[PDB]
DNA sequence: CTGGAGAATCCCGGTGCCGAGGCCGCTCAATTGGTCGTAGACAGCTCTAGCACCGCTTAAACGCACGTACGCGCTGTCCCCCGCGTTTTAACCGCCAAGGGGATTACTCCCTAGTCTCCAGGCACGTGTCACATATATACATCCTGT
DNA sequence: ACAGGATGTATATATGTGACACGTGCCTGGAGACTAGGGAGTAATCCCCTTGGCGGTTAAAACGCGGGGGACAGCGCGTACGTGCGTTTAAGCGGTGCTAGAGCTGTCTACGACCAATTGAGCGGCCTCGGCACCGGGATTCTCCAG
C-alpha cells in the first residue's frame, strides 16, 4: 500500500529506545509526525539557501551541518552536530 | 393559542409541557386530579400523554392528529383508568376534505396491524 | 448574521483563567471579541485563498494549517 | 539487502529522507551523506523530545505519552522552547504558573 | 420524566417497606443525592428518568442491579438509539419491561425490546429478524405473498415472554369509552392558505421528488395551516394601495 | 450561607483550567462564527469538520497567549486586575500593533 | 505505604434486621403524610412608594 | 495564634470502553549494480582590502555641583468586578430516511516546457565629468524662564 | 504680563565628494527545431452531511444583587535625574605602508545522476487485551469567620 506515508514507524522505534515500556497516543504520535516535518523543511530550506550562499548547486552534509548550527540553541546544536557527524562517519565506512 | 382561546372564554385551566419542570408536573396533576373549579387541562400529547393518572376528568379532546397510533391510544387511556366514575367520551376534531382525514386513516391502519400482530391471546391462561 | 457574540463572557473568562488572569475588567469582553474577529478573519482569509487555488470547495484542515503557518502562528497536530 | 539507514546505527529512514531532499526543490544535488546527516539530526531531536514527553507523562502516573506531556516536556526545556517557540502543540494546554502578585497572603 | 414522582408516591402509598431514592435535579443536586449510595442497602428502590440516565451512566453501570425496570418501554423502540446502548450496558440479573403497547408503529420494534430482555435467546440480529418478518411488516402495503401464514409461529414465539391483558372485555366493572369523532368545517382563510400552498410550483415539485424529510416538511407545514394560521402565517394588516 | 472572599474561587479557576488541556470556546457558536467570517470571502464555501477544529485550537492558543501577555501589563501598573490597558500594551510590544 | 482499604465496618443485612428497617420505613410513610398534606405559598407585598 | 465549620482536593481501589499496539498481506520504494558526464576541489596567482601604524584637531565624553521634577508610599474614597443564587436560552436526541455535492483517481492525449543550439542587442564596468547640498553665516522667530 | 536669554529656523551661497552621461565590449537573452511529461478535459466511484424541524429535557448563559477590596485621586516628601560648566580623553579625519587572503582561473577526478532490475520495508487492514477515564470513599488540606 501507500497513499499517506508518515514518520510513525520511526517515532515509535526511537521511542522504544528512550522508554521501552512507554507508549504513545494516536494524537501525540500525530503531533510527533508533524513536528519532524517542521524541522526537516526548516533545516533543508536553510541548507538550500546556504548552498545558494556559497553558490554551490548541491546540498552536501556540510550545508546540512551549517544549517543545524544556525537553528539549535547551543547544547542542542552541539549534540545534533555530533549525532550527524557520527552517522556520516559510520555510514562512509560501510 | 389554546391557552389564549380559553381565557377569551373565561375557562379556568392549566397546562402541561415538555418545559414544565418535574415537581410542577406533579403539582399540576394533583391540583387537577384532586381539585374541581378547574374546567380544562391543556397538555402536550407526548410530555403530558405518556403515563400519568387522571381519573378526575373525562371528555378527552384530540385537537391534533398523528399517523402513529401509539400516542393517541396512550393519551386516551389517561382518563380511562381504574378509579374512573363516569363514561369517557373522546372527541376528535378532523378538518373536512383535508389531510387530517388521511392521518386518521393511517392511524387506523397501523392500529389494525397491531391488533393483528400482538392481541392474539398472549394471556396468562395459555 | 452577526454571531461574534457566540464567544461569550464566560468563555472569555475561561480563556483568561487558563492564561493566568485572575481579574477581568468589564470592557474586556467587547475588546477580546474585536481582537479575536481580526485574528479569525486573517487566518480564514488565507485559508480560503489556499482553497480557491486548489480548485476545491471545502476548506480542509491543511488549508488552515498552511494559512496559520503564513502568519507565523504554527500549530502542531492536524497533519501539519 | 541493507537499508542505507541501518548502515549508520540508527532507527530513522536515511532512504526516504533522501527522496524528500531531492524532490522538494531545495538544490540540484543531494550528496551521499546529506540525508545520512539530516536523518541523524531528525532522529536526535525525536529522541530528546520523546524521552522528555514520555516520562513527563510517566511522572503523571501514565504509561502512554500524551500530548499534554508533549507540551510539558517542550515548554520546560530551555532549548526546545527556543526551537519550538512559535509552535502551538494542539490539545497541550499551558504550563501551571501563578504570578506572585495574584497569589494571596 | 412526568411519571417519576408517581412511582415514588405510589410506592410510598402501596409498599411503605422499601427505601426510595428519586434521582432528579440540577447538576450538583444529583451529586448530592448520590452521597453514600455505595453503602449496603443505602437505597432499596431507585427511580430515575430515561433522559437523565443518558448523561449519568458511568455511575449506574458500576452496580449490581437485581432488577432493571423500564416503564413505558415504548421509549426504547430503536436499536440504534444510543439510550438503547446505555440501558443495554447495565449489569442486571433480571429485566422487566412495562408498556401499554410494546409496538404499534411497525414490526422490528419488538426485536429491540426482546433482545434487551433476553439477549441470548434473540441473539440473532436484524438480518434474521427482517428476513423472518418481511411478509408481516410488508403485509400492510408492500410484500404480502405469504398472506398471514407466518403469523402463528411469530405470535407463538412471543408467548413465553409477555403478558397482554386487555382492560375492556376481561373486566366488566369499568365505565365505558366512546370514540366521539367530530368533523370540522371549511374555515375560509385556513382553506385559502391550504389550497394556495398545496398548489404552488415548489410544493408540486417537492411532492413529485423529495428526500423524505422535505415532503414531511410539506405535510408538517400543513400541520401548521390546518391547526391555526399564525402558525402558518399571521393575517396581514390590510391597507390602501 | 457561606461565600468565598473575592479571589479564592478565582485562583481555583486558575488552577483548574491551567491544568486541563481542552477547548474553552463553545463548539457550535465558534463554528457559526467561522461561517460568518468566511461568508464575506467566498460565498458557499464548505468547511471540513476538522478545519474548524484547527481554527478553534489556533484561536484559543492565540487568546490564551494574549491573556498571558495582558496579565503582565496589568501587573506592570501595580494592578492585580487586567483591563483593556494591559492587553493593549502587551500587543503593542508583541509587534501586533 | 499510605493505604486506605476501608474494610472496617463490614456491615451486612439480616432477616431480623429486615423487619426493624421495615418498621422505620413504616414510620417514614407516616412522616410522608406530612408531605401529602399541604400549606400555602406565602406571596409578597408591593414595592415601597416614592414621595418627592 | 489557635478554634471549628465547611468546602475543596487527593490518592486508593474498581469497573468497562476503545484506542494502541499486534500481526498479515501485498504495493512503493528504497537498494544493488554500472556507465556517464561532470561539482568542486585543490593548486597557483592577480591585486584589493584589511589591518596597523602615527599626528593634529577638537568634539565629546565625563565628572561635579544644584535645584527641580519626578517616583515609591499612604490613605481615603467610591464603585465595579466576584461570588453565588435564580430565570432563560441553547442544544443535544429520536424520529425521520437518504440523495447529492464533491473530493479522489485514471485514462487518454495535445500542449507546454526542457534541452540545446547558434546570433545580437543590452548590461556591466569603466571613464568624463557636473553639480546637490553639506558646511558656513547671519538676522528673523519663536520659545522660554525669572521677575 | 513682560524681556533678557537661549535655541530653532529660514534663506542665501559655493565647490567638491558623490550623481549622471557615453562607449564599449561579451556573456546572456532571444530565436528555433525536437521530444517527452505534465497537466487538462471528462468519466466513474464512494462517501459524508445537509436535508426542516420539532418538542423534550438538560447544562451553560444570562441576569440580579450584595458588597468588599482594589482602582484612582489627593498629598507629600525626598531622592535623583537633567542642566549646565569646566576638564581631558580619546575619537576622527587624514595620511603612510605591509602582505593576508579574496577572487579568480584552470584541471581533473570523485561525485552525483541515471536506470533497470529487485526485493523488503512499510502501510493499510482487521483483532484483542491493557490502560486510562470516570466514580465512589474517606482522609488530609485550605479558606472563612470568630475570639
Ligand atoms: Mg403510569
Curated annotation (Swiss-Prot), chain A:
Per the record, the covalent cross-link Glycyl lysine isopeptide (Lys-Gly) (interchain with G-Cter in ubiquitin) lies at 4, 90
Q: According to its record, what are the GO cellular component terms?
A: cytosol; extracellular exosome; extracellular space; nucleoplasm; nucleosome; nucleus
Q: Which residues are glycosylated?
A: 82
Q: Which residues carry this modification: N6,N6-dimethyllysine?
A: 27
**Which residues does the record list as N6-lactoyllysine (modified residue)?**
13, 55, 78, 86, 90
Q: Which GO biological process annotations does it have?
A: antibacterial humoral response; antimicrobial humoral immune response mediated by antimicrobial peptide; defense response to Gram-positive bacterium; innate immune response in mucosa; nucleosome assembly
Q: Which domain of life is it from?
A: Eukaryota
UniProt lists the family membership as follows: Belongs to the histone H2B family.
Q: What does this protein do?
A: Core component of nucleosome. Nucleosomes wrap and compact DNA into chromatin, limiting DNA accessibility to the cellular machineries which require DNA as a template. Histones thereby play a central role in transcription regulation, DNA repair, DNA replication and chromosomal stability. DNA accessibility is regulated via a complex set of post-translational modifications of histones, also called histone code, and nucleosome remodeling.
Protein name in UniProt: Histone H2B type 1-C/E/F/G/I
- Whole sequence portion shown: 32 to 125 of 126
Swiss-Prot record, chain B:
Domain Helicase C-terminal stretches: 1-124
Name the coiled-coil region(s).
none
- Location within or outside the cell: Nucleus
In the UniProt entry, the disease listed is:
Floating-Harbor syndrome: A rare genetic disorder characterized by proportionate short stature, delayed bone age, delayed speech development, and typical facial features. The face is triangular with deep-set eyes, long eyelashes, bulbous nose, wide columella, short philtrum, and thin lips.
Q: Which family does it belong to?
A: Belongs to the SNF2/RAD54 helicase family. SWR1 subfamily.
The annotated subunit structure for this chain is: Interacts with CREBBP and EP300. May be part of a complex containing SRCAP, CREBBP, CARM1 and GRIP1. Component of the chromatin-remodeling SRCAP complex composed of at least SRCAP, DMAP1, RUVBL1, RUVBL2, ACTL6A, YEATS4, VPS72, ACTR6 and ZNHIT1. Component of a NuA4-related complex which contains EP400, TRRAP/PAF400, SRCAP, BRD8/SMAP, EPC1, DMAP1/DNMAP1, RUVBL1/TIP49, RUVBL2, actin, ACTL6A/BAF53A, VPS72 and YEATS4/GAS41.
* Role summary: Catalytic component of the SRCAP complex which mediates the ATP-dependent exchange of histone H2AZ/H2B dimers for nucleosomal H2A/H2B, leading to transcriptional regulation of selected genes by chromatin remodeling. Acts as a coactivator for CREB-mediated transcription, steroid receptor-mediated transcription, and Notch-mediated transcription.
Protein's UniProt name: Helicase SRCAP
Protein species of origin: Homo sapiens (Human)
Q: Which residues of the full protein are shown?
A: 2074 to 2199 of 3230
Swiss-Prot record, chain D:
- Keywords linked to the UniProt accession: Acetylation, Chromosome, Citrullination, DNA-binding, Hydroxylation, Isopeptide bond, Methylation, Nucleosome core, Nucleus, Phosphoprotein, Ubl conjugation
Location of N6-succinyllysine modifications: 82
Q: Indicate where this protein is primarily found.
A: nucleus
| Post-translational events | It is involved in the initiation of both imprinted and random X inactivation. Ubiquitinated H2A is enriched in inactive X chromosome chromatin. Ubiquitination of H2A functions downstream of methylation of 'Lys-27' of histone H3 (H3K27me). H2AK119Ub by RNF2/RING2 can also be induced by ultraviolet and may be involved in DNA repair.
Q: Which residues carry this modification: N6-glutaryllysine?
A: 82, 105
GO CC annotation, single: extracellular exosome
List every position bearing N5-methylglutamine.
91
Q: Where is this cross-link: Glycyl lysine isopeptide (Lys-Gly) (interchain with G-Cter in ubiquitin)?
A: 2
N6-crotonyllysine modification sites are: 23, 105
Question: Where, subcellularly, is it found?
Answer: Nucleus; Chromosome
Residues with PTM N6-(2-hydroxyisobutyryl)lysine: 23, 61-62, 82, 105
Which family is it part of? Belongs to the histone H2A family.
Q: Self-association or partners: how does it assemble?
A: The nucleosome is a histone octamer containing two molecules each of H2A, H2B, H3 and H4 assembled in one H3-H4 heterotetramer and two H2A-H2B heterodimers. The octamer wraps approximately 147 bp of DNA.
What this protein is reported to do is described as: Core component of nucleosome. Nucleosomes wrap and compact DNA into chromatin, limiting DNA accessibility to the cellular machineries which require DNA as a template. Histones thereby play a central role in transcription regulation, DNA repair, DNA replication and chromosomal stability. DNA accessibility is regulated via a complex set of post-translational modifications of histones, also called histone code, and nucleosome remodeling.
From Swiss-Prot, chain E:
- UniProt-annotated location(s): Nucleus
Question: Residue limits of the Helicase ATP-binding domain?
Answer: 1-120
| Subunit structure comment from the entry | Interacts with CREBBP and EP300. May be part of a complex containing SRCAP, CREBBP, CARM1 and GRIP1. Component of the chromatin-remodeling SRCAP complex composed of at least SRCAP, DMAP1, RUVBL1, RUVBL2, ACTL6A, YEATS4, VPS72, ACTR6 and ZNHIT1. Component of a NuA4-related complex which contains EP400, TRRAP/PAF400, SRCAP, BRD8/SMAP, EPC1, DMAP1/DNMAP1, RUVBL1/TIP49, RUVBL2, actin, ACTL6A/BAF53A, VPS72 and YEATS4/GAS41.
Q: Which disease is it linked to?
A: Floating-Harbor syndrome: A rare genetic disorder characterized by proportionate short stature, delayed bone age, delayed speech development, and typical facial features. The face is triangular with deep-set eyes, long eyelashes, bulbous nose, wide columella, short philtrum, and thin lips.
> Which family does this protein fall into?
Belongs to the SNF2/RAD54 helicase family. SWR1 subfamily.
The protein's job, in short, is: Catalytic component of the SRCAP complex which mediates the ATP-dependent exchange of histone H2AZ/H2B dimers for nucleosomal H2A/H2B, leading to transcriptional regulation of selected genes by chromatin remodeling. Acts as a coactivator for CREB-mediated transcription, steroid receptor-mediated transcription, and Notch-mediated transcription.
User: In its UniProt entry, what is this protein called?
Assistant: Helicase SRCAP
Give the originating organism. Homo sapiens
Report which part of the complete sequence is shown.
676 to 916 of 3230
